[PDB]
Design a protein around this ligand. Structure first.
Ligand SMILES: C[C@H]1CCCC(=O)CCC/C=C/c2cc(O)cc(O)c2C(=O)O1
Ligand SMILES: C[C@H]1CCCC(=O)CCC/C=C/c2cc(O)cc(O)c2C(=O)O1
Lengths: 268, 268
């Protein structure tokens, strides 16, 4: 069954983390909301195929909120990558397969480029490369308007599955309520310009598997499809939108397992 | 003033056609519903920038219904391209810029590849390359069932602006009512396999500008973005979905004028 604990890294972060299984390491990095309970169903299904699965709340979010302001303000992909390397160091995970969506996508590409010895293969979903004035403008609002605006975006615009999103339960939505203002002030103004996609030739031949949400409006991640095709990187679709691990947890878990198995075959 | 008239071609089709302005030729090929009143506002705005704009109902549809059955059954891009050449010959249009959406997109690419001397440049929008069972299965239903199903699909799924779609009015929606069964029996089973995008190298360096609808679900024209990028073809977005000339006629008109002006410059 599942380990649920905390670990402190020398950068001042106290992480909430979860771990299940034994075998090769698979690390599920959250989206910007930093909430690892969204992986709860898929952690068990992936672990049961012979993997050790690790996930965690992101610095300043949810149960990893005990952290210095630097880790949840002016956040970049490069910062997030150095923070994940810190918890992998503390958990003695030397070689890992990594999943990440949105800011997590930018984090896993930064990990694969920045720390190639540590990363077997990366799965990135919907990597945000463009500033959006309407997300950036939330940063200057009051806490309670931010939470009302962004809770409605998640539920009605980008969940890919409103009932599955609601079924996360009241405890999860109470933690997200407090994350929204932190995310607004620290993420949308600085994440997109940090996207590690400026150098197409740097992506060519890397063990990277790129997805976009099948139901996402084409304009949102059009640029991801162009970039992946130019770099020869494997690019495909998962069902739903920004949270395939919430909207379609069984399809998500099968994709993570089969993608990790394909790379374990290739490395021999 | 706009010409609104008919003209007969030796293949047995009597075409309903419209034409406005003087200057270089721009030809607007309808989508599969074959209904050229959807271009009405855009024809005026494009002609006013110094172009002769021509459009027409497609064979067996709307006011071009007088035509042999061959022209609206087992329909391919290559068939529609030979029909468009027949009406350009009849109207003495020697060299034309062409636009087409959906089966029209397939048509304008088959025009550019098959009649390079006739085509200055082609704008293709949302080219259908994949068989869709839920569309192919309409073919075997009763006329009034096909029209009720496909009227609902156009309005609620792919119009990209339900208000502007309804504002096409009673007369247009009554012509579409009769087209739906004709389209269902002649198009969805034979159009996608005829998509001229199998040969990626044949597209490279051609005067082709490709768009997808910004609001269309990513899954629908993902393959277009991949193909255009592999061929090095200009690819971008228009607002809305399958009917940018209905949902956003001013943006559509500007796109057609600017794209044509760019190829007029590049030709000298
Ligand atoms: C929560 C997640 C998906 C849900 C939010 C969503 O899909 C809004 C539109 C796409 C942008 C996401 C995004 C953009 C940023 O600049 C920084 C981010 O951390 C995100 C992001 O993490 O969005
Ligand atoms: C009417 C138009 C856009 C409206 C219909 C629409 O967008 C349905 C999904 C996309 C497929 C369109 C299509 C597929 C075919 O096999 C043959 C066609 O002629 C079309 C087509 O022309 O769809």
């Amino acid at each position: 069954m599942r380990t649920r604990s905390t670990i402190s890294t020398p950068n001042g972060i106290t992480w909430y983390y979860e771990q299940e299984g034994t075998g090769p390491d698979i690390v599920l990095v959250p989206d910007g909301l930093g909430e690892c309970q969204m992986f709860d169903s898929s952690v068990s299904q992936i672990a049961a195929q012979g993997f050790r699965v690790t996930t965690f709340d992101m610095p300043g979010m949810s149960r990893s909120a005990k952290a210095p302001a630097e880790t949840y303000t002016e956040v970049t992909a490069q910062k997030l990558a150095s923070y994940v390397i810190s918890i992998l160091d503390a958990l003695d995970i030397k070689h890992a397969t990594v999943w990440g969506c949105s800011s997590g996508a930018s984090t896993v590409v930064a990990l694969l480029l920045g720390y190639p010895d540590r990363i077997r293969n990366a799965m990135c979903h919907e990597l945000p490369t463009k500033l959006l004035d309407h997300l950036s403008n939330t940063a200057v609002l009051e806490d309670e308007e931010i939470s009302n605006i962004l809770a409605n975006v998640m539920l009605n615009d980008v969940s890919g599955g409103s009932e599955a999103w609601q079924a996360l339960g009241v405890e999860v939505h109470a933690r997200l309520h407090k994350n929204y203002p932190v995310w607004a002030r620290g993420y949308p103004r600085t994440i997109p310009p940090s996207a590690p996609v400026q150098d197409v030739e740097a992506l060519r031949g890397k063990p990277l598997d790129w997805t976009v949400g099948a139901a996402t409006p084409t304009e949102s991640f059009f640029d991801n499809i162009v970039t992946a095709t130019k770099a020869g990187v494997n690019i495909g679709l998962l069902p739903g939108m920004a949270f395939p691990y919430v909207s379609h947890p069984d399809v998500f878990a099968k994709y993570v397992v089969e993608t990790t198995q394909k790379h374990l075959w290739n490395s021999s």
